[PDB]
Symmetry: D2
Subunit: 135 residues, 4 copies
Amino acid sequence: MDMEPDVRITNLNLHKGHRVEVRGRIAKGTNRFAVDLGTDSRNLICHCNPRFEYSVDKNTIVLNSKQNDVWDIEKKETAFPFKSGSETMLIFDFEDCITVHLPDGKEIPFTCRFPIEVINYLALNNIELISISVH
Amino acid sequence: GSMDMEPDVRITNLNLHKGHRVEVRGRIAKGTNRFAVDLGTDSRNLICHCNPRFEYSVDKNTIVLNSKQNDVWDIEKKETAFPFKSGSETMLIFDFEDCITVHLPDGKEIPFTCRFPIEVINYLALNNIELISISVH
Amino acid sequence: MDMEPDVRITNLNLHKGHRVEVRGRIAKGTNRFAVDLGTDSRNLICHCNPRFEYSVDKNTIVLNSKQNDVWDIEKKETAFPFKSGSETMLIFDFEDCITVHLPDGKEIPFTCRFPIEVINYLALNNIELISISVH
Amino acid sequence: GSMDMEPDVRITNLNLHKGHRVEVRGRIAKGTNRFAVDLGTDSRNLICHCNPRFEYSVDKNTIVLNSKQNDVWDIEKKETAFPFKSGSETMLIFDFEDCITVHLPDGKEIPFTCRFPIEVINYLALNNIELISISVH
Ligand SMILES: OC[C@H]1O[C@@H](O[C@H]2[C@H](O)[C@@H](O)[C@@H](O)O[C@@H]2CO)[C@H](O)[C@@H](O)[C@H]1O
Ligand SMILES: OC[C@H]1O[C@@H](O[C@H]2[C@H](O)[C@@H](O)[C@@H](O)O[C@@H]2CO)[C@H](O)[C@@H](O)[C@H]1O
Ligand SMILES: OC[C@H]1O[C@@H](O[C@H]2[C@H](O)[C@@H](O)[C@@H](O)O[C@@H]2CO)[C@H](O)[C@@H](O)[C@H]1O
Ligand SMILES: OC[C@H]1O[C@@H](O[C@H]2[C@H](O)[C@@H](O)[C@@H](O)O[C@@H]2CO)[C@H](O)[C@@H](O)[C@H]1O
């Protein structure tokens, strides 16, 4: 991948009915960043990928899932409450349907593409960790 | 009536000095017309009234900033960036310097120069937003 | 009172089934500090008052309630996980019986001395605010 | 078996430099004999293994600190202050400098000098404690 790998967490043990809050500083001048959740690096239930400019996307959020290292079909959100070099916060509610809380107060649904009962893997790409909290 | 906001928390003796920041998280009242976070020395003397308006007065999805001295409002500054949804959580961070910086949750900042001399912000209030947390650094 | 008044919060609207977490820096070299919860300054459901040295108490927590400015009967805890000039954290679970979570993992019960359904008043004395959060 | 702790979170690519601190909140496993928070470059090379022991080996209600290089443990440092209860939440803060400072939740600090040269802590692990939050400053 092109992005700079930042923090990874393994053995996260995040079960359904719980949420993860990710705060961090978006890389200055970056084209895109991502927060990934899943079972391991090859198996992502949620790849949340705001793009300043990448591929055909400009100030768009791409969401996707990855199974055995193959990407599923992208879903795209046009709301874009981000600025590179700035702090941001994303909250992920883990249920049968994931809810991504954007920092502008919008909630984006993303249904689980594959059955999963525990998220053990979390990764940050092109965003420097400030804090991660689970509730 | 609805031209008035419901008072939420008031914090006194905040002792926020220049070179420091305050972070406010809270849940915006559902269906509300506007909400505010106010900073100053007391309710009559505000160095920064940060008032996002969903619909109020002539303003639609617009941030109004102002100051208040001796209970009289000064000139409004308006910002068109509007990263808020009523009924949702939000976070505003205020960097206290000679020029206040209002960090919006979409990563934009709004400068707001101190309109009167002030060295300590001791008063912070929330209106039409329910406290989740307040942090100082 | 002798202690330095630090932050006060009014209109806190803390209902039963919820908790407040108070982080702060204990005044350097201080004799005691307190976190107070109640309906207003004259009416405290919980005055949590760790004493380094005050009155007959040395490295003891005094808990009390105050009604119309008159103190009730003190309850005292000997566990003393505090150091003056240092950061600390106290968590208060609001129920019919308040639970004070000390930073050493101990939970101290304090029953409500008077009927109260909302805590609207919070005060810090001889401790400088770092953060207050409600859940 | 019970001489081994259950692995909890592992964080890699932490990029913690000197002059900065990491704060770890978590819930200590109920009934457990010991728990640990480890800092270093990987699991074989630890600049600080902070291991409060309820009862383990010759140690009762004692903090064991050590370092590990090339998967070999160095000399244990023991601290008698023990502000922990199994099954409860706890918070440990680590200030990374030439001398690490371990801030215990009772307000005591434990110095732990760097036993080998290190400029970045990239690995952080929790054993017999369930993550609540990790924060860097
Ligand atoms: O679906 C998420 C991944 O997208 C990959 O990029 C896609 C791109 O989004 C699409 O427009 C088309 O161009 O093909 C690209 C490569 O398959 C990223 O490279 C990857 O990192 C994910 O974000
Ligand atoms: O400037 C902040 C205060 O505005 C007051 O309303 C203004 C209004 O914004 C303006 O368009 C005109 O109508 O005058 C009003 C009175 O000064 C709000 O009433 C007040 O709560 C502040 O937000
Ligand atoms: O009960 C809490 C209040 O105690 C007052 O001090 C008591 C003291 O604890 C007791 O030993 C006896 O000496 O009388 C004192 C005064 O009534 C404090 O002054 C007050 O601030 C509370 O902490
Ligand atoms: O020094 C940290 C490691 O200690 C290991 O156990 C020690 C034990 O503390 C000591 O008393 C003696 O029994 O030798 C043992 C082996 O080095 C733990 O097994 C290990 O997990 C660390 O905590």
